[PDB]
Amino acid sequence: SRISAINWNKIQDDKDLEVWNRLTSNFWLPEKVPLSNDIPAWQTLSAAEQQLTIRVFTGLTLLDTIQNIAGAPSLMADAITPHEEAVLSNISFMEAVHARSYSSIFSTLCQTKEVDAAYAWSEENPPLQRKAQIILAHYVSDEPLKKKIASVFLESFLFYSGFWLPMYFSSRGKLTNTADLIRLIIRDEAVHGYYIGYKYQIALQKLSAIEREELKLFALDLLMELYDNEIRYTEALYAETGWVNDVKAFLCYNANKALMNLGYEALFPPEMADVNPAILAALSPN
Amino acid sequence: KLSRISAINWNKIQDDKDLEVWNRLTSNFWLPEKVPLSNDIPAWQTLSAAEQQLTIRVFTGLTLLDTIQNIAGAPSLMADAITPHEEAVLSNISFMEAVHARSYSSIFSTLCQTKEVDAAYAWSEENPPLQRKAQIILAHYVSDEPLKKKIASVFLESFLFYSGFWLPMYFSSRGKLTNTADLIRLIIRDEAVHGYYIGYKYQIALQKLSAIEREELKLFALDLLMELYDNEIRYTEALYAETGWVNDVKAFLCYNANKALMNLGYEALFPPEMADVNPAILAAL
């Protein structure tokens, strides 16, 4: 028995139709955002701030390119309902839109030499290569639940973390339209992690207690590995700024969200995940 | 990073047509919800029990093909992309295939009866022709013959598919089911670009092969087209049996088989005498 025609009037899990409706309904393209209105704001940023922004965004671009190419697609083979497969094909597509959005921003605000140098930086940056390597290794592996754990960490932790910068600038009245575009990405990202995290939880109920325990420990070890590598990434990128400690706190905040999307309890105490209300205000994240 | 996957750069297009198609397909985004299907409810009851059943089975068969294209087709063409932008384009195509398929359940929900719909599904799960065409195309998508996969997908989209759109487009000319006709038009606006683009990439791949290999593929194409053609003929003679339009369809099958070959860069296989179709039908497409 091959493939059967999909019946959307035979939903097997109401969650599938809900996410499908939310994701498709929230469709958008970078051309829909008035990025050109940030050109003046861009001009008020220091040379150091401009480089920082470009490198950060190139980093996010790498992550979504992977999610578009290997991430979302590697989960489609593990879907437990035909409707899930359709939703995953929408997620994969939107990851392409997300990756494409950064080029939109580069075309509108930056100079070619400046952007090309950033792409060269991303090719050699240690922490960025390592994080891409780690996740990608799980995506090509044989263990489905580990692919989902990696995917949620990529979306609810690694990604969100890069959103601090546009959100900070926006709180200062700079790059407000780019910030709007990032909130469009977050609106998708929040649902992606939630959904994939939910499917992970269901798969867990079908396993022995010994097996759930092995995955829980795996989850925490992978998180600490990605977390500490993200701290190093952060300390090098924001070396100047004076914003390193704010970003770190943001990392812990999102790591807790990644964990709960997986069905686990928050791991970082409030004293480590205290995000400036200005960032939270201007945010609208998970 | 390193030599692994690199961040995609849309300001360094490697083939202008990748950007063109990306913009056209994303610009044409749509969902079945955007179509006032309900406005077709009245006209729907003006059809006999035979017509309704026929229609529902045609749409079920089409639903089977898109589901395949969404999960197996488009996705298998991924590994064969020759530019990063093509990969992103194929992911959009794969997504829209899910929208196409989902659209049919919308039509059933808005105009049919549960028992009546589940009837078509059981039918497709055993209809000899349908299961065979699905078996043929799907066998290629699973293999490691990149160019054959492209030939197969072009046949699945520019030939196998359009062959079912005839019916809905007739009602359009007549006056019945006008909103469903708008929907089908949206699916066609996508389908036409899909065959064109993939046929385009197929031709790029051909120039890189030896002269003997191109002839080999060129022959393989005709051998696959005919096998699906006769299997399609058997499919048409059955469903449209009653009605008395089988001839109209047999003539439509040939029309789209020539257009599918053109997407691959080949010459027409059926002379205009066999691939002729009512001007009204064509005027709706």
Swiss-Prot record, chain B:
Belongs to the ribonucleoside diphosphate reductase small chain family. Keywords: Deoxyribonucleotide synthesis, Iron, Metal-binding, Oxidoreductase. It is an enzyme of class 1 (oxidoreductase). Tetramer of two alpha and two beta subunits. NCBIfam families: PRK09614.1-1, PRK09614.1-2, PRK13965.1, RNR_1b_NrdF. Its cofactor is Fe cation. PANTHER family: RIBONUCLEOSIDE-DIPHOSPHATE REDUCTASE SMALL CHAIN, RIBONUCLEOSIDE-DIPHOSPHATE REDUCTASE SUBUNIT M2. Its EC number is 1.17.4.1. The lineage of its organism: Bacteria, Pseudomonadati, Pseudomonadota, Gammaproteobacteria, Enterobacterales. One of its GO terms (cellular component) is ribonucleoside-diphosphate reductase complex. The active site is at residue 104. Fe cation 1 binds at residues 66, 97, 100. It catalyses: a 2'-deoxyribonucleoside 5'-diphosphate + [thioredoxin]-disulfide + H2O = a ribonucleoside 5'-diphosphate + [thioredoxin]-dithiol. Fe cation 2 binds at residues 97, 157, 191, 194. Pfam families: Ribonuc_red_sm. PROSITE patterns: RIBORED_SMALL. This is Ribonucleoside-diphosphate reductase 2 subunit beta. Provides the precursors necessary for DNA synthesis. Catalyzes the biosynthesis of deoxyribonucleotides from the corresponding ribonucleotides. R2F contains the tyrosyl radical required for catalysis. GO terms for biological process: deoxyribonucleotide biosynthetic process. GO terms for molecular function: metal ion binding; ribonucleoside-diphosphate reductase activity, thioredoxin disulfide as acceptor. Binds 2 iron ions per subunit.
